[PDB]
Amino acid sequence: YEDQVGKFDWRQQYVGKVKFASLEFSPGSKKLVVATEKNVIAALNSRTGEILWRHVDKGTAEGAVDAMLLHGQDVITVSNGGRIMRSWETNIGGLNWEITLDSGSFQALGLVGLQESVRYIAVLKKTTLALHHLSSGHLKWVEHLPESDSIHYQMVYSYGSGVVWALGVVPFSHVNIVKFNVEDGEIVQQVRVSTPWLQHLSGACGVVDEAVLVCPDPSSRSLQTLALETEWELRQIPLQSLDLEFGSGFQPRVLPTQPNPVDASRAQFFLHLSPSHYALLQYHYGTLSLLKNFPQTALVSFATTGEKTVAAVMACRNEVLACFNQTYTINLYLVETGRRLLDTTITFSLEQSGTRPERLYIQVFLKKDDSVGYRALVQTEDHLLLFLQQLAGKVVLWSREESLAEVVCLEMVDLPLTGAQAELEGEFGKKADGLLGMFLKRLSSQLILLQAWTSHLNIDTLARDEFNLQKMMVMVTASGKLFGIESSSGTILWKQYLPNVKPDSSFKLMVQRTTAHFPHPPQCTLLVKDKESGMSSLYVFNPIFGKWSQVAPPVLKRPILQSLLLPVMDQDYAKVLLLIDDEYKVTAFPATRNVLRQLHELAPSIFFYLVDAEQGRLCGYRLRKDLTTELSWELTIPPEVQRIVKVKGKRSSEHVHSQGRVMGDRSVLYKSLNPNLLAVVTESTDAHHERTFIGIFLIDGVTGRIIHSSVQKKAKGPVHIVHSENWVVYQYWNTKARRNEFTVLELYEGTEQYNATAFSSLDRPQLPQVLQQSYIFPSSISAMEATITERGITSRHLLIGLPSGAILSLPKALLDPRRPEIPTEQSREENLIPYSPDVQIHAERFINYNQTVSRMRGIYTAPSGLESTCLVVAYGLDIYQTRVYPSKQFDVLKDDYDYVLISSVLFGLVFATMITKRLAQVKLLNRAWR
Amino acid sequence: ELLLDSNIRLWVVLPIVIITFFVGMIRHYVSILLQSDKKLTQEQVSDSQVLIRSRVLRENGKYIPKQSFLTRKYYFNNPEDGFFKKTKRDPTMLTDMMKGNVTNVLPMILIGGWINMTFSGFVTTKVPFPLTLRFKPMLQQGIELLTLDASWVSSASWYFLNVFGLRSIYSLILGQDNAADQSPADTNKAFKTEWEALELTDHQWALDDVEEELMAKDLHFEGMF
């Protein structure tokens, strides 16, 4: 904190992919109300695209938004499968009423009107229909529609007639319609018709004009119609008379409109015949006419300015499927007549390739000259929001990368060396035989530097900072998107897209070669694996510029299971990467001749461990000379009583400064630094509150020996474990007392180390002793990761991620298990605080002040330069970046240095020395002469 | 190693050295300015010079014949002659001398304390030899680190090392036996001890054998030009 807000940290607020959106608002209200797939309901500023009020919800499906509607100034939402219905005041940014509903799957949401004004909400579930007041949400009336145990209701209609229309279907069979009255709710009427060809109503059918039902029938290439006010039997009209046809193997759709719920729908409507094909049809008293046909058009949208309806149609400039250059034009068409608007065409270009727009919501208004001026919010396929305004300058208003809402994995890559430092790595290494040559090159470099000094009298120029405190984050997003974000300013430097990436695919990002090899480009590898198919692929890219490297990745024919980043490097300083396939063969990368020789000579020292959680099995495989694996060790935690939930092993890129610790007494206690120690944490499959338990095994990674096999009784997940140099810390829930608890496991060897020259997992016959202690954490948790420094000199801190959004910096020294229950002289010599079961969450410890990170998912800690600053990236819904100083920034000049005092004392004391020298000389002369 | 901030050199390393150097110069010049010779009356300087003459006589009376020496003895310590027999006789001065003695070290310790406050929380320089861990609490004042190598030192102890290692430089530039560093009242008893000592002294006329030790070698005469 230290009240240096905004100097180093930066937060970005991201909502998810926009599932439902609402643009209709007052022209001066300048608001968008959008609910996303991330369970988030938010308001976006129209002018600049920023969050006004955001309300996150439960991460699970128990809070998913299912339907949005807007009326007047408050937006009405349904969540948890129709369980809760809420009304949000868009101006203030809070609820107006929250009402729970009865069981039954929600199917359709709509409004009703009495005579001229909308005042109630009709919400329909698979077995019932309900009416709720707008003012307070009090239930008006609930009616169980007849025979509903067999039918599936799909839509609800009402208008100023003061009646309610309900429609239900049975697949490939008859459909039914019910007339209710708003005043009472009793079943005014009920009709049934036969629709053998119909499949479902919501996706396919629609209703236009005066409640006229319209189902497009592809079996006969026609438009089945039902004048629902009076007609009792469906009528048929072929599209051949209108010169129209349906596609093959596709479900045509129909898009009606309703400018306000009280008035009847517009007669004109859209028909989606086939993809990239639309029609405008105007029904008029038993017959329909084609208004305008739109071929090769991706998306259409509707809007109302108050009196007239406006249709927006999207298509690229020239088709080349796909599109020529990702340049899409949107044109306005009047709904009264299928005539294109004048000087309303908009044209924009999507930066990426292979991405096409998916959603289009337009907002219209009256210009000064009464011309319909419109803006368009378009969501692309890769979860990107574009706001397009009519005027040519800055055709995109605010481009929002909502994709970064769900980040799976990220790594920090150091920036390239600056120009002023590039030559310091080129002159070195010459190793000239004669000293004269060395002197010549040294003096030449000196003259070059002198000339550069005397001369002093954006991704293009990206350069490393002096402290190496400014890195660039390569981020991977489950939407399949790769980002490069500068860690200092938070801006985006490069974006890339991976085509055809399933939402549930598992990623793994590895930094194969950093920037300390200037003649060679930095190179990172991302490993994606589709869950459904099982096939995995490798994408290698430069993490600085973002372009795919020319080094073609190998084609992984078989599904793979695990990957390793061996510290051995090729001649071009690329860290060898190993993959284990399903046939337990091993594929190397880059797998050159030198790499193959190096890892063949070092083959028997490479071990994989695969943890199959489905069967509750752990296996550990060797590495033979000919790149093959053999069953070295195998353990089985029986899935019938225990399922493996976490396999957190210690980070490979860390160092430990003090091998042992001073115990006082003038003696030393040696830590058990085992680098191959897994920390497999499993939950009890018995979910009962009194018999549940959580096990933690400190399984070795090479010999398979179980160092520790702790089982905590009366506890339940979720469990968040961090594994570090020596200790492990796993937070869990305690069902018996209802309180979150920590449990620190510290591994200590004897008073004398078994071996100091080297550590081998095959030569550790002494089981390290374990020290345990359980503390109480007075809140929940969402993500943990220890702060890591380059040399490990700086003390260790745990970045507790609370649900509130703060990031508590809990000192690891507090969680010491050696804190005695009764203080003694030994403890005072070691300065150990007496054991206190309560751990405080004092608000002054938060590494962030009020930039809360809602629904925190993970904390990444990077060593950075220096020794007191660790870079922190908390990723979740929001993404936040900062630096932490666990040791109060011991190696950096304080920001409150008194320059005007030190310089003043220096230059007022040199003058004092001169004055006192003159005084001493004068006094000496006077004393000599007297 | 440690990637120490470069700005720690331009403002915590060099300024400490400059402060120590010029504070030593200031202290020496203030010391010479403050020193004032105490007023002495005729009797004290007279007796001090008399005992000076007595001591130099005791030291090198060997170049004086025996009769002159024993006449000196009669004059100095003998009832009949009378000399050495009929020759005898919060305060401001104590506070002043105590303050003068105090001002030779205490200003250095006060400067050290001021430096320790002003430059607290840094790591200034690495002492190039492996100091013991038990010396940690005083070398690394203001640092919360635990596993840090003992060879890393904070600002206060670096200033102390500077003030210890700069006295020789002071003697080099300021002048020999300078006052910038870190580190008779009664005549009656003096009269009596001179009496007893010169009673105990003997005579050895060094001229008893000068001729024979001169006759042995010829007189040096070259370089007359």
Ligand SMILES: CCCCCCCC/C=C\CCCCCCCC(=O)OC[C@H](COP(=O)(O)OCC[N+](C)(C)C)OC(=O)CCCCCCC/C=C\CCCCCCCC
């Ligand atoms: C890379 C690290 C090396 C460190 C450098 C220190 C060693 C370099 C030394 C001497 C080379 C200079 C030769 C010039 C001849 C000077 C002596 C001489 O025969 O010529 C006579 C005149 C006046 O004689 P005097 O009464 O003044 O000498 C004092 C008399 N006696 C020695 C009996 C006390 O000399 C004069 O012109 C007055 C000037 C006297 C010499 C001034 C040099 C001292 C200045 C700075 C020394 C260190 C201060 C900064 C270092 C901080 C780092 C911790």
Ligand SMILES: *[C@@H]1O[C@H](CO)[C@@H](O[C@@H]2O[C@H](CO)[C@@H](O)[C@H](O)[C@H]2NC(C)=O)[C@H](O)[C@H]1NC(C)=O
């Ligand atoms: C989060 O905290 C910061 C820092 O306290 C708040 O920024 C301050 O806002 C007030 C209100 O205008 C200003 O007077 C201060 O000068 C701001 N601080 C600084 C350091 O500039 C910020 O408003 C807080 N966020 C919220 C949502 O309240």
Ligand SMILES: *[C@@H]1O[C@H](CO)[C@@H](O)[C@H](O)[C@H]1NC(C)=O
């Ligand atoms: C394609 O679109 C991009 C937009 O970034 C533009 O820079 C480029 O000139 C376009 N190319 C053509 C041939 O229209």
